[PDB]
Design a protein around this motif. Structure first.
Motif, PDB file in Angstrom:
ATOM      1  N   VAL A 222     -17.976  41.194  -7.653  1.00 31.84           N
ATOM      2  CA  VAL A 222     -16.560  40.270  -7.473  1.00 31.84           C
ATOM      3  C   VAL A 222     -15.481  42.065  -6.984  1.00 31.84           C
ATOM      4  O   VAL A 222     -16.619  42.671  -6.102  1.00 31.84           O
ATOM      5  N   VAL A 223     -14.789  41.689  -6.747  1.00 33.47           N
ATOM      6  CA  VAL A 223     -14.127  43.603  -6.432  1.00 33.47           C
ATOM      7  C   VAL A 223     -13.497  44.037  -6.943  1.00 33.47           C
ATOM      8  O   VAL A 223     -12.718  44.638  -5.962  1.00 33.47           O
ATOM      9  N   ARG A 224     -13.310  44.149  -7.658  1.00 33.84           N
ATOM     10  CA  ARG A 224     -12.675  44.879  -8.855  1.00 33.84           C
ATOM     11  C   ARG A 224     -13.691  45.495  -8.854  1.00 33.84           C
ATOM     12  O   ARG A 224     -14.590  46.046  -9.381  1.00 33.84           O
ATOM     13  N   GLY A 225     -14.346  46.727  -7.801  1.00 35.44           N
ATOM     14  CA  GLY A 225     -14.305  47.881  -7.998  1.00 35.44           C
ATOM     15  C   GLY A 225     -16.094  47.269  -7.486  1.00 35.44           C
ATOM     16  O   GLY A 225     -17.085  48.131  -7.917  1.00 35.44           O
TER      17      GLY A 225
END
Length: 11
Positions: free
Chosen positions: A3-6
């Motif tokens: 995912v894009v959360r870091g």
């Protein structure tokens, strides 16, 4: 790809 959360790459 995870995912894009870091967590995203280039997708």
């Amino acid at each position: 790809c995870r995912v894009v959360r870091g967590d995203y790459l280039d997708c």
